[PDB]
Every structure is written in structure tokens, then in C-alpha cells.
């Protein structure tokens, strides 16, 4: 900064500067610290702090100048690292901040505590046990204040202390395992303040905003998060401090205390040893079932969340031959409650399904369990979740997404005596495939997983009926609604799943789908959709095999036009080349129609080169080369066939063998080749051996680097290169030893 920063600093340090001059400049200084990177500001940090501390000092009469300077400190902490390093400069900064927290003005008071929070978040290691009680006294008093903006800073401070000390606990745990001293050692401030922290936080849980709002962030919510972070930070230590509050207020006539009891209990469910928490959950269960039917909307919401958190963190307790029946019964009714409650109920069911599935007995010769502890309730709970789906208020609290997520999870994690209900409800879900698609992000992957799951375990004719529904929904989708880029991609990946499971039986749907597959391959602008469409063709090649023949003319046309287009993202090219191999492998001799142009494309793509410097392009070249090798492999094998002798059709690839082996030889000579490329090269060499015979051996032996590439492959770490390089060596050895008479 040529002259600017010094000008600002001088206008604060100057004793003749007016109240306006100092105050306006510190705000200007403050915003500058929010702008530039430490590149310029770390030289000036010595001078910027001089002006900042000058404005915060006890001796400054104006509170406006104090606030401006205290706010400026907050923004400058990103590069006070070198100043915090020396203890005397640290002693001065800390004293100024601590004295600023005692200022009669509230605006300064809050900003001074904001500093303690951020300093704690950044420089934990530089805080000595010396500062321990000093910081404890200021932040605890901040917590006990009637002003909410003051209370929030006191709570956030310890939440940040917990975050830092949890990472240090992790740091110490791995250091012990490895037999090392931890790089940094925890000072356990949270453990030492826990006695005093919990009574305050439990009491702050009683100050809920009766006029409820999710956007608003207040001391009551912060307290809940704080107790939760204290539970994971201090583990079993927290239990004796929170439990007497819970037990005393769980049946308080005042809803605010009753709500605090269920919250506090829910907050301590992770951290302490599950062996302590399980009997406590069992003890609290009857009361928990009562609190589900609480008159107060607030208590129910917290009760559902507590139950929903029990099911996730402590599954063995949620399943109980004693309380399961009344638990499931009240969760059913909870789906008819407000979205605040019903969403957590959905979450509870999903965890219960996983819990009941994991626990279920599976014969050690069988795939799935015959029965599980949700079988009696299965049909009822899966029906009420679908009705929860039809709720016109499903948008709020994300009820609709929670209901579908449950429905899927329940259907996935199910016993055999639930299969009729599984099949019925999964038909309904697939009927609404469009709005499930157009609906967080894992929901689509979980939908593909469940569809994959159901199709495999249900009776074959029932899987065909589900497949009929899925395709009926997708074909209606494409033909009705416009077609969003993210939506189409998810729709294609959905098709991929069905194809991979159905195999050759997908041929039913091939007619009605081919236009929409074509739209995907024609989508140059949104290449992610394109890549998915390219991927699907390969899946179709493995599924339909030679039955894809009457669909190849068009597909091949689209794939070749895609390659000829100069504006298609580079990711698409190698995938199309790979899929040429899948086509040739599927259609066999029928490929002769496309052969010339494909071989000419592969030849051009193989000779493509990028410069050594570009780290990204070198990774791309190998991805392109891998696809080139794969393509040839699919072509050589495809025209060869699976018979006794080689089909004469491969002799059309014979003129290309010289180029192919030169391409492999050039790959071998390149030190920067990948294990995937080496594997694909070794694979191709073996293929050439089986197709063309002893001549290949001679041409391989004349290119000595190929011998080295094979040696490298058999010794490689990966399973792919190991297997294929051994196979090519074996195939080359067969050609070496053929026509040799054996003797005893």
C-alpha cells in the first residue's frame, strides 16, 4: 500500500484528531481488513493494530470510537498471527479486549465478546491456563445477562471452545494409537467449566420464542447446540450435571420447562458411553411416549426429535419387546401432526427400519431375513407414510422429502413377509417418479438404490410390473414437461439402473425410449446429460447385446456427429470411443457397416498429443488413450466371436495391427502412463494374440518396450493391470511354444 494505510493509521494516532476523525477512519480501516489478502496486510498488521488498540484503550472517552475500533479488531484477526505469537503483545491485546468487555456501552460489550469468540476460534494454542479463569468469568457473566445479544456471545464462546477441544481429543486419540506425543495439547476448559455451564444452558432452554420462527437465531437455540457440543466434547462428564434437571422437569406443568427437559435429554445422547444412555432411554420411554401426545406444539416437536435421535444414535434401545409396540403406535399418530413433528417421526421410522433389519436373523445360506420386529406394523406404517406424502403442506419442514426418504428406506430394509406390502408401496412411489425427481440430493441416489434393491428381491413378474411403471412415468415425463438439465441427468441415471437389472428384458421399452435417448446424445450444451446418455448406450449394449442391432444406425450417427462437433466438452470424446467398443462387442459382425469410419476416428484420436507442462491435459491424454485401447479391444473381440475358431471378419482389422502395436509401443515409451492405460494396453495385446496368431508375437518381440510395459503391469499394485498383463504374457507364451512336441 504505497501511502494509504499509513495515512489512516496517522489519522487515529494523532492526538489532535477529533472524535469524528478517529471514529470514521477506524470504520474505514475495518472494511479494508475485510478486503485485501494477507499479502499486503501482514506488513501493515503491526501499524493497523497500533491504531486499532489506540481506539479501544480504556483511556479513550468516546464509546463511538471504541465500537469502531473493536469492530476493526474483529476483521483484522486474520493476520494478527505474528502479534499473537509474542506473549507481551498477546498480553496487551487480551487485556484491551477483556477491558472492552466491561464497557458500560452494550454495543462495545457485544463486539468485545465477538473478539474473544473469534480469537478462541483462531488462537486456542496461544491461550495459557493463566487466561483460563479470566475468560471463564467474562463469558459466564455474558451468558447470565438479560440482554440477548450479550448472551449469544457467551454461549458461542464455549461452543467454539468445544469445537477446538473435540479436534484436540481426536488429535490426542490418534497420537496415542501411533505412539506419538500429540502435536498440540488440550487445556480442557470445557471440562472445568461444565459444573457452571450446564445450569445456565438448561435455564436458557426455558426462554423459547413463543412466537416461533426458524430464521430467527436466539440464546435458547444456541444453548441447545452448546449442550450438544458439550456432550460430545466432555462425554460421560456431562451426565450427572444434566440428568437431575431432566428428571425434575420432564413432567413440569409449565411447557417451557417440560420442553427444556426433553431437549436437554436429546442433547446428551451422543458423547457419553451408550452403556450409560441405553438404560436411561429405557427408563424415559413411557414418559417419552406421553410427551408425543403433549398438548403443547413445542414439546411434541422436541419429543419427536428426541425419539428420532434415540432411534439413530442408540438403536438397541429403540427396539424393545416392551416398548416397541406403544412406540410404533404413537409414531403412526405423529404422522398426522404438524410438519414440525411429522418430519422427525419420518426420520425415526427410517432409523427403526435400519435397526430392525440389522438385528434380524438371516439364515447363513439365505440372502434376506424371513421376519423382523416391524413385520406386524409394516403394512400400517408404510401406508401412513404414503398419506403423509399426499399432504398439501409437505413443503414446510421438508415433510414430503422426509416421507419419501422413509418410504424408500423402509422398503429397502424389510423382511420377506413384508414383500407384498413392499411391492404395492413401491409401485405407488414409482408412479410419482416425476415429482420425486423434481424434488435432499441423496434422495435421487437412494431412489436408484431402492429400485435396484426391490427389483432383485421381489418375484420376477412383480419386478416386471415395477419396471413397467418406472418407464411409464419416465416416458410421460420427457413427453410432457420441458426438461431441466439436472432433472434429465437423474432421469437417465434412473434408466441406467433399470437397464442394469433388467438386462435383455429391457427390449420391451427400447422403441418408446430411443427418441429421448437421442435427445441426450444430441445435448452438446449440457455435457453431463450427454455423458449419462453415452454411458447408457454401453449399459444397453451389455443388456440387449445383439438385440441392439436395429437401434445402432441412429445411435452410431448421433455418436459420430457428436465427435465431429468442435464445441463439445472434452469429457465426452473418450466416453464415446469406449462405447464404440461396447457396440462392436454387442453386435459382432454387424459392426462391419461402421468399421472403416470408427478405425479412422480411433487412429486420429490415438495420435493426439498435449504438452508435458499441462498437468490436467496429461491426465486427459491418458483417459483418451485408455478409451482408444478399449475401443480396439471391443472391435477385435467383437468380430472374433465366442466360437472354436476365429471368425474371418477380424481380417478387416488386420491392416490396422501395425498402427495399434505402434500406439501401444509409444505408450510403453512414455514414463507418464497410468496403471489403467497399461492394463488396457496389455488387454489389447492379448486380444491381438488370440485373433491374429503367431505374427503378433513377432511384432511384439520387435518392439522391446512392450515387453517392459507387460513386466511393469504384472508387478503393478492394482488388480486390473496384474490380471491382464499376466494374461497377455500367457497368450504370448502360447504362441512361443505352439507346435512343439512334448516328451517324457
Amino acid at each position: 500500500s504505497p501511502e494509504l494505510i499509513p495515512q489512516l493509521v496517522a489519522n487515529v494516532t494523532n492526538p489532535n484528531s477529533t472524535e469524528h476523525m478517529k471514529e470514521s477512519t477506524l470504520e474505514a480501516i475495518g472494511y479494508i481488513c475485510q478486503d485485501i489478502d494477507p499479502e499486503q496486510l501482514q506488513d501493515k498488521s503491526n501499524e493497523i493494530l497500533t491504531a486499532i488498540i489506540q481506539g479501544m484503550r480504556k483511556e479513550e472517552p468516546s464509546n463511538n470510537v471504541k465500537l469502531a475500533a473493536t469492530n476493526a479488531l474483529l476483521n483484522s484477526l486474520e493476520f494478527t498471527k505474528a502479534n499473537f505469537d509474542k506473549e507481551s503483545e498477546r498480553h496487551f491485546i487480551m487485556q484491551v479486549v477483556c477491558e472492552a468487555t466491561q464497557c458500560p456501552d452494550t454495543r462495545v460489550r457485544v463486539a468485545a465478546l465477538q473478539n474473544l469468540v473469534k480469537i478462541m476460534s483462531l488462537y486456542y494454542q496461544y491461550m495459557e491456563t493463566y487466561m483460563g479463569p479470566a475468560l471463564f468469568a467474562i463469558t459466564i457473566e455474558a451468558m447470565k445477562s438479560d440482554i440477548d445479544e450479550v448472551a449469544l456471545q457467551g454461549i458461542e464462546f464455549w461452543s467454539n471452545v468445544c469445537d477446538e477441544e473435540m479436534d484436540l481429543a481426536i488429535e490426542a486419540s490418534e497420537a496415542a494409537e501411533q505412539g506419538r506425543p500429540p502435536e498440540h495439547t488440550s487445556k480442557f476448559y470445557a471440562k472445568g467449566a461444565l459444573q457452571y455451564l450446564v445450569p445456565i444452558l438448561t435455564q436458557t432452554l426455558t426462554k423459547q420464542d413463543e412466537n416461533d420462527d426458524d430464521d430467527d437465531w436466539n440464546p435458547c437455540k444456541a444453548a441447545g447446540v452448546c449442550l450438544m457440543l458439550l456432550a460430545t466434547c466432555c462425554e460421560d462428564d456431562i451426565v450427572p450435571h444434566v440428568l437431575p434437571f431432566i428428571k425434575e422437569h420432564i413432567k413440569n406443568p409449565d411447557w417451557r420447562y417440560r420442553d427444556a427437559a426433553v431437549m436437554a435429554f436429546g442433547c446428551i445422547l451422543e458423547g457419553p458411553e451408550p452403556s450409560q444412555l441405553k438404560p436411561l432411554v429405557i427408563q424415559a420411554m413411557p414418559t417419552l411416549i406421553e410427551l408425543m401426545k403433549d398438548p403443547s406444539v413445542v414439546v411434541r416437536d422436541t419429543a419427536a426429535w428426541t425419539v428420532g435421535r434415540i432411534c439413530e444414535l442408540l438403536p438397541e434401545a429403540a427396539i424393545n419387546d416392551v416398548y416397541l409396540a406403544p412406540l410404533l403406535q404413537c409414531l403412526i399418530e405423529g404422522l398426522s401432526a404438524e410438519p414440525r413433528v411429522a418430519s422427525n417421526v419420518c426420520w425415526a421410522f427410517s432409523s427403526l427400519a435400519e435397526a430392525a433389519y440389522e438385528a434380524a436373523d438371516v439364515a447363513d445360506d439365505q440372502e434376506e431375513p424371513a421376519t423382523y420386529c416391524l413385520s406386524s406394523s409394516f403394512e400400517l406404517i408404510v401406508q401412513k407414510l404414503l398419506e403423509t406424502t399426499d399432504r398439501p403442506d409437505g413443503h414446510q419442514n421438508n415433510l414430503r422429502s422426509s416421507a419419501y426418504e422413509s418410504l424408500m428406506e423402509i422398503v429397502k430394509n424389510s423382511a420377506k413377509d413384508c414383500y407384498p406390502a413392499v411391492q404395492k408401496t413401491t409401485l405407488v412411489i414409482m408412479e410419482r417418479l416425476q415429482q420425486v425427481l423434481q424434488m435432499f440430493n441423496d434422495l435421487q441416489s437412494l431412489l436408484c438404490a431402492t429400485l435396484q434393491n426391490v427389483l432383485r428381491k421381489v418375484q420376477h413378474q412383480d419386478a416386471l410390473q415395477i419396471s413397467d411403471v418406472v418407464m411409464a412415468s419416465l416416458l410421460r415425463m420427457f413427453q410432457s414437461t420441458a426438461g431441466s438439465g439436472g432433472v434429465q441427468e437423474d432421469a437417465l441415471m434412473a434408466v441406467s439402473t433399470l437397464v442394469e437389472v433388467l438386462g435383455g428384458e429391457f427390449l420391451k421399452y427400447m422403441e418408446a425410449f430411443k427418441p429421448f435417448l437421442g435427445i441426450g446424445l444430441k445435448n452438446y450444451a449440457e455435457y453431463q446429460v450427454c455423458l449419462a446418455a453415452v454411458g447408457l448406450v454401453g449399459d444397453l449394449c451389455r443388456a440387449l447385446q445383439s438385440n441392439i442391432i436395429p437401434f445402432c444406425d441412429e445411435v452410431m450417427q448421433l455418436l459420430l456427429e457428436n465427435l465431429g462437433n468442435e464445441n463439445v466438452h472434452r469429457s465426452v470424446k473418450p466416453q464415446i470411443l469406449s462405447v464404440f467398443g461396447d457396440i462392436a462387442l454387442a453386435i459382432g459382425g454387424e459392426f462391419k457397416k461402421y468399421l472403416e469410419v470408427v478405425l479412422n476416428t480411433l487412429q486420429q484420436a490415438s495420435q493426439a498429443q498435449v504438452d508435458k507442462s499441462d498437468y490436467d491435459m496429461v491426465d486427459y491424454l491418458n483417459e483418451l488413450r485408455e478409451s482408444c485401447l478399449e475401443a480396439y479391444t471391443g472391435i477385435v473381440q467383437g468380430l472374433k466371436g465366442d466360437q472354436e475358431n476365429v471368425h474371418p471378419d477380424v481380417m478387416l482389422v488386420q491392416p490396422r495391427v501395425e498402427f495399434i502395436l505402434s500406439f501401444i509401443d509409444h505408450i510403453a515409451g512414455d514414463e507418464d502412463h497410468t496403471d489403467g492405460v497399461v492394463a488396457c494396453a496389455a488387454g489389447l495385446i492379448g486380444d491381438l494374440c488370440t485373433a491374429f496368431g503367431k505374427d503378433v508375437l513377432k511384432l511384439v518381440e520387435a518392439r522391446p518396450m512392450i515387453h517392459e510395459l507387460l513386466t511393469e503391469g504384472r508387478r503393478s499394485k492394482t488388480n486390473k493391470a496384474k490380471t491382464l498383463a499376466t494374461w497377455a504374457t500367457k497368450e504370448l507364451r502360447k504362441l512361443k511354444n505352439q507346435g512343439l512336441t512334448r516328451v517324457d
Partner: peptide, 30 residues
């Protein structure tokens, strides 16, 4: 989104392995 990238990578790997299984069947391996 980070969730959509991993959803994309997982499918490509699966398609690549299924391709390898089909070719190695034609090659007669393992």
C-alpha cells in the same frame, strides 16, 4: 454440488467394471 459429482463417479466406475466383466468373459479370464 458435491453430492452430484460422487453420484456421477460411482456410476462410471460400475459401468467400467461391468464392461471389464463382459470383455474378460469373451477373453475367458478368471
Amino acid at each position: 454440488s458435491l453430492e452430484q459429482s460422487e453420484r456421477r463417479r460411482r456410476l462410471l466406475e460400475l459401468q467400467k467394471s461391468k464392461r471389464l466383466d463382459y470383455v474378460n468373459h469373451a477373453r475367458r479370464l478368471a
